[model samples]
Target chain A: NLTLRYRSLVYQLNFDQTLRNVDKATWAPRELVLVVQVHNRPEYLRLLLDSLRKAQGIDNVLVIFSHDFWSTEINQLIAGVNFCPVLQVFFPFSIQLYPNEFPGSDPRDCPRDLPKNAALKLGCINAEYPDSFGHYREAKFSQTKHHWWWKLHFVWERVKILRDYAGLILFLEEDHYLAPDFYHVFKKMWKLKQQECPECDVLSLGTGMADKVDVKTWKSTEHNMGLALTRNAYQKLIECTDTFCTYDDYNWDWTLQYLTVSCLPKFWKVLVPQIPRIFHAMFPETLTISEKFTVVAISPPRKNGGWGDIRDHELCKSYRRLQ
Target chain B: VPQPEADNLTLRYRSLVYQLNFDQTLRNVDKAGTWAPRELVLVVQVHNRPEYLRLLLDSLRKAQGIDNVLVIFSHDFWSTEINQLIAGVNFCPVLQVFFPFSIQLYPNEFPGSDPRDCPRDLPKNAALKLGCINAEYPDSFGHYREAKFSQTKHHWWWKLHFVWERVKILRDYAGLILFLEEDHYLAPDFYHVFKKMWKLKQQECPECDVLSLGTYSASRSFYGMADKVDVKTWKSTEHNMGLALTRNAYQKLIECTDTFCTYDDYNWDWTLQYLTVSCLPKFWKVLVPQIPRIFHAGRPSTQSAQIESLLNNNKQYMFPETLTISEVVAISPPRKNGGWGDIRDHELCKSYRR
Candidate 1:
């Protein structure tokens, strides 16, 4: 049952195929996939959608909104996204779905500091193992990690439309806001990377402390924000299933840090820009494509506490494996 | 006062910072006071808790063979109180390793609070309007960064990164590195018990990752089977205090640099637990004493008299015989604790390795 609970969502979860803007028979290679994994932050989602609507080449991409929390208000927010061929999928194992049990908080859950001996006596689930502090498990901590983990699999292993998609899938978050030149800047950045550094398998689209462009300095860095990875590198993550799922961190991006360090051949060296095209906001929260051209950019905090509810989890988990 | 540089900093800052023009040596030997290798080295992590540290230094002063072991007073918080106190660790060999990227060094910049950075409770819309550096980015929660809170983990991390990678004295040294806190007080037999732990460590508890000189303080402070030791999955609460790490073991942790530096959890122990469970080939197993050779006292500045009495009473804890491997039941590798999610911390941590 170590991975069975979260990893099971890999097989059990499915995305709604009918929610796309493009038609079945004539859908062109959506070539670029931009996915934003959202929680309940509608304002930020609205801000992100607005930015994407105004992005330079919006109509050429398939914009995906992967959500963990659902509401009439949030649904209404995404209803007006008109720029790109939009698609939406909800994380099936979210705390919103499982309101009272394993995926969500239960009243009888083990205390954070309860000794395992006492935990087993109390009939808690993970009685054999206590966290680093001799603390017992809780559901709120597991859901975010589970959903991000589940979506990582759903796109690669479950979504059929993306089966032949081989371009960069840039994974984003609820709180990030993109620049108007996001698409244009990203293309030039991707083009410039191959011309300069070829060994790098990933590119960071948005991160910079200053605004100085030195193309001569583009090299592999560990910037994880606005991460763009090659589809084959998903093979690296897919192989590290247990390592990624079972890592103790609640945030998925940081957990990816764990995988790069231990599971992958070497930690990924990210290509970045002097000026970031993507901007990360507070209270928030990958794909692989390698091209050998010249130029471009690059990289979580604050655990939002609303994820403690059980109903959110049940609703999230059941959305998994939908045909 | 925009930002202080080499021309305007204090003497310790210059000595601590490495420039081609200055000297950086901060030590002496086993009264045999020269620092070398294969001897016991205590790395007591201190952050301004001066009174407790003074008592710890006093307690360490009473330890047997104190002159032979190297006492490295590692610091992050910069205050003359702490500096002067550590300066008085005269009976034994001591060295001060300051965390270079500390709040003290960069008081007006990144690790510290930048004038342009968003306020801890600033709203996103307003932050965006003001065009603050983190208009999009909130801190650990839905707030901004606090130099006070972020610096501890940052300092501890950089201190650790610098210790294994940059410290020249530790280059080929093959000895046990015991980690302690300023608030910790060790028994007079600490050095003796550690030597005893080392003797039995390789031959007896061969698979253990660390040797713990302490346990959560037991009320029954007598010496029965005090020498009894147990090996259990290394939980930070049970084994982190006064724990001894070997060079072989240290290298493994050094190898886990990426995961340790970037994990969202602020507590170093939590990150280590995740690494041992998810990164290292196996979970870390620790050898802990039945009776603690070290104990922490949280007594305040209100009453200073009782501390000396309590520290002086540390001698009777002589554990008899070598470790008798008392068994502890099973435990799963630990889950992480949060609070360390700042992007600035991630960049600076990655910077150290670079």
Candidate 2:
């Protein structure tokens, strides 16, 4: 009932109705749609926006900010971007709105450390299920996976401006910084994908700043930066929607990797550049950079906890219910 | 928008969740040692047919070694009468799980019918103009969403996943599970013959996917072939009745969840046929008994003659030592039956995975 309730609200909200950028209809047709996933990182998004404004051919892109929470400052910061057509989309089922309920920490929920055997004896809400690690559900962690899945489906299936527009859509994180050449590299690779590797499924612009890049022979899997895909990939992704949402892993990218041998048949070859055009700014607050640029590190992300404010949840719900 | 409902429906929804908790229902699994023979997991998919269910229950009770197996009764339509009958079963280790996203549970909303849905006979143009929820896909039969018809496939798919994925008793189970309908009446030698088939499977047809215990027709022509069997690529219409699946076979089927859920066939069996053709690397080879151990009644109000006609005779010994390997291209399923064209149904089916 919890997920179904979330799904109903999701389908009810119209993306076209919600997204009404000032120059969306008046601007040149978009060559790329940058779907930036954001949380409450307003300063981080401001830097990404600054980078986008400086990028060559910036005005031709449609930048969509997919936020997991609502901060007036973040909203106002996004509203001030004048270089491109932008729309803000919020994740509806963020744990904030339901702080005392599911997708949040329900009062009846078992502690993450409680042994499921004892939890079941005590009759907790989700005592019947635990991960392979014997841990219960963590709302803030699973919320990311849910947000990612919902965001992409909304873009491909529900959005109106790009209903017939055939171009690439790139996924970016709020903290991710672009190299100013990222858009140029992405467009060229997408073209190479069509001209040479037509059978290839996904378009990627970054790898761990690895060897010399010439948009070389396309391969399967990427470094999870500036990851872009086409209409066919969206179709294939939706076809395996059941597995993507239900898989035990909380990371969306890992779930995509899991689908290679499990579903989607054969193997997917991703078109990528030899040298990554984009890189992660994980520790922006660090005074001195001791660690070199990291990419192609498939996982080992610790959960970041802040998502407890009831006001943000209420705002997230309102954003989802927008006409 | 507005929450949709009916009084008994909300109760059924909660009751479905209650029943699926596994801790309360799946009792009586006491094992002596860590190592033992794999079990004969029998799952009976039930609708509103109580009389036929009773008849099947009686036959199962009479089967030899009844106490050793687990009979799971999965239902979509929840009622006091149905629940009462299942609770009274004292024969074997039993579990009764309900399909949570049932049409009966959401009679007025999704997985059921929503007020915004297109009418069954609405024209495509008019429906599109009216801005209905599912004006996109309509079947060749010119039909739209009808809860009972589509929910049949949903129930079949949902129950299969729930049993394999969530049911605690089956956490470490590595065996063949035989699936049945409530109308099917079984002969007393069902398990004895199945055990023989599994032994044959591990020995000869290791590549086989299913061991079917029934045939397409209910004829008594092959009276002498009680123990005889024919192994061939599984045909939907032929191998549909009295089917059993290994854990390996279920893995293959679950991988094709999208194909099965979206294919334009309302019948679960036909959807499976499409999957075998389109999804798998090779066709499934099913070893089937020439004399069916189970027969689908397709009837009610009376179950007496079935016992006399087909159920009683399978007990006598005529265990044939040889097998028939059919070489012909066993059966070719033509195309979809075309009732599953609604995008709403497709989305709901895919989303219910969790």
Candidate 3:
């Protein structure tokens, strides 16, 4: 019976003195480079950068931040600032997406001109991609379909940019912050991939996904680092893209993962790494790039942005040590 | 690697995927406290095919000395036979079925689609099959690759959420969550075996992480050459290398859900395997050498290229009936830094060559 078959295997597993198997040659990679693609997420981006900058024992790092997603002049200024060795300035899709025709009559007003799908695409332009609060409110108050379209367009654009890079590209969405030791974790994963499973192709550095399991490392020598991916695995992804952008599904990440993780079984292996407490900014759009770059993004502010609006030198001193 | 300080540990049970909406298996650890009937929980994601499910259910029902097993079935759709057979199981004490997004429940949800087109496969093919590829993503497959396989991104999210919820269901529920997919059946002694292995922990097998019971005898380890853990022959045959876990070695398996899931977007098993066995510096030793018992899928199970093979074929399964556990076949010798580029297409490898 099936019961007996399974039973015997279980029994045999326990009692069996199976000899240990060891591989002679190694196949892991030599150097691990973490390329961070950042444009305008200066405030939150600063926190993550600082975390990477402070990581211990990590000397060989090619920290590439595509830092040019603002107005043309500001973009130039940021380009001049030397944050890291491999600082990159990206000039793709930085132009304003609004006002195609002119002032009074917006393209949004004429819905019949475009197809329904295209119209739906530009629905969230105002609120999400608004030039300012006033522009956002005008779209929100009047409720132009552009606002919705903008949000959709924004995501589509983001997905496309992410898809451009091959090999293990660890994406860091601006607002999505990283832990202090995120680079250390990511760096170790790169080393392990080259060493153990060269097939790995991804390492998500942010805090996002379906479930978060509670795992602690006893010795922390080097175990499967949480999650990692292989290059060939990403190739399997070439099979499905449309289902991704307009998935309409609530959980975009799941849809993306479900494709490779669930659909393509040929290329996959879950690597459990030490979980890091990625610090997420409670407030949105709080600190500007200049402010954050100075003292690094603060969690429990003591100086500069102070504790509750008022400046506290003592609090700053206390928290400075922790930070 | 810096030691994970108490403060460095960031734990949360929420994912960007379908927020733990509905879990039928009342054994969820998140909502309920960890004081339920079962300790070890096996959460599975199964699709169509009642025949396979019945065999799986029957095996689970009949397995011996196995008590306190809480089984959560996440079905994509409900067929009469599957529903009836799942409901009829009298094997373990606790059993529950969860339909995360059944078409019946959310008729008008996103992908407000046909039940068969689950992940939409990007829905481009169906669109193309029905004449709509132009309406799909520019590089639909490319985007799908990026979106889907990047990091086991969202699926891991859902599973983690379920585990967190599952953990809350039964207290001290053995503190171990074995995540298995549908088609793979456990050898009868699976529970007993895992229980024993759990007791042995890392000391018994420092190399093993998520214990993998041999797939078919084709990938087993024999006596001759057993010092290699990384041995492989170039065999691309469709073998049942099923059965994996998101939370295997608690000390390492469980980590930041968000951080872990944010990966190259691929299958859950890949993420689990890499994280548990490969990335982590441990070996996932085979406990029951070659357990003939497995997560059942098809009968007459020689590799048939189509779905109808099991429905009509008369060939017996590769596994012998009475054989509770088959002795592990030897692992093909390991090639130094060998990969798909070097191995032959039909060659076989095993744990022995490692």
Full-model lDDT for every candidate:
0.63, 0.67, 0.35
What docking class should model 1 receive?
incorrect
Candidate 2, B188-298: lDDT as tens digits: 777877888888777878888788987856555555566577777788888888889988888888888788778888999988887777887677888887777787777
Per-residue lDDT value at A250 in model 1: 54
lDDT of 3 at A22: 10
How should the candidates be ordered by lDDT, best one leading? 2, 1, 3
Per residue, candidate 3 scores C-alpha lDDT tens digits across A1-323 of: 32222222222222221111111112121233343444454566545545554554434333334322333232222222222223232311121211232111244442323443454476732222222111222211211111221222222223322233344534343344455555555555455545654443444433222122112211111221222333454445434443332322223233344444334444333333324435445111111111011111212111111011011112112211221
Chain B TM-score, model 1, reads: 0.85
Alpha-carbon DockQ of candidate 1: 0.00
DockQ of 3: 0.01
Model 3: iRMSD? Answer: 27.7
State the lDDT at A90 in candidate 2.
Answer: 64
Off by over 4 Å in 1: A1-323, B1-16, B19-35, B123-130, B300-319, B328-337
Fnat of candidate 1: 0.00
A1-323: candidate 1 lDDT, tens digit per residue = 32223222222223224333342326554446787788887878777876786777767687777877655456555544534565667675556655555565556677776777788888965566554455655666776667766676677667666877778888788888888776665676566556755666776765533322233212222354576767887777777765555555555666666565566665455666556778876110011233334433222223223333333333333334333
Error of 2 at B321 (Å): 8.5
Which DockQ value does candidate 2 get? Answer: 0.01
* Residues B154-268 of candidate 1: C-alpha lDDT, one tens digit per residue: 7666766566667666677777788888888787777877887777777787788888887866544455556777677888767777878777887787677777777867777
Ranking by TM-score: 2, 1, 3
TM-score of chain B as predicted in candidate 2? 0.89
